């Protein structure tokens, strides 16, 4: 600033916190899923969600899924494919259609 008005301190941005619009789309991402999880079953919710760690502090895996219900780790991945397939029918992925467009 050639008159005693401005400095280099004015001209730099701190892209650290979040974008205002994008911190809003985090919640609309989150409040999408639980309604999308609401069209499911309780044993069906508990295999797919806590594996990915949604709303839990941890990331459970196929072993901690296996040793708890009974033994099986094989069919839970196949249980989630039925949690994939009925939701990949374009009837409950409308509120997944725009977050698909990230």
């Amino acid at each position: 600033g050639d008159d005693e008005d401005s400095h280099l301190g004015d001209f730099i941005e701190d892209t650290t916190l979040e974008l205002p619009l994008d911190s809003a789309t985090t919640e609309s991402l989150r409040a999408a899923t639980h309604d999308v999880l609401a069209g499911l079953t309780a044993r069906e919710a508990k295999v797919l969600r806590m594996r990915f760690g949604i709303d839990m502090n941890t990331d459970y895996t196929l072993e901690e899924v296996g040793k708890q219900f009974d033994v099986t780790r094989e069919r839970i991945r196949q249980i989630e494919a039925k949690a994939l397939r009925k939701l990949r029918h374009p009837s409950r992925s409308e509120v997944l259609r725009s977050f698909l467009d990230d």
């Binding site: 001209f11 730099i12 941005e13 701190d14 916190l17 911190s23 809003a24 919640e27």
Partner: protein
């Protein structure tokens, strides 16, 4: 010029200057006296906390506008406690007497 919500600085978490860097305006200290004489208190809380600094305010303002509940939850400016750490830098103890 226009700016709804744009970019911010790094030392004081304030909007920026100009039509160039997608900047906000300047609400100068002459205008605060022009605003005090109306007695319009709430806009003076509005035009420093929720529109310049208060980071919990500036999101929960901007999130709540998308709902319609045109409601304020204010706080303290971050340029207030940028002043504390520098007045605390020079061996002076400043603090807050809690209620």
């Amino acid at each position: 010029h226009a700016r709804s919500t744009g970019s911010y600085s790094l030392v004081t978490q304030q909007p920026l200057g100009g039509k160039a860097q997608f900047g906000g305006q300047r609400f100068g200290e002459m205008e605060v006296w022009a605003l005090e004489a109306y007695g319009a208190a709430y806009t003076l809380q509005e035009m420093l906390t929720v529109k310049s600094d208060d980071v919990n305010g500036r999101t929960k303002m901007y999130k709540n506008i998308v709902d319609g509940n045109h409601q304020m939850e204010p706080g303290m400016p971050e340029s207030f406690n940028v002043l504390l750490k520098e007045i605390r830098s020079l061996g002076i103890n400043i603090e807050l007497e809690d209620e």
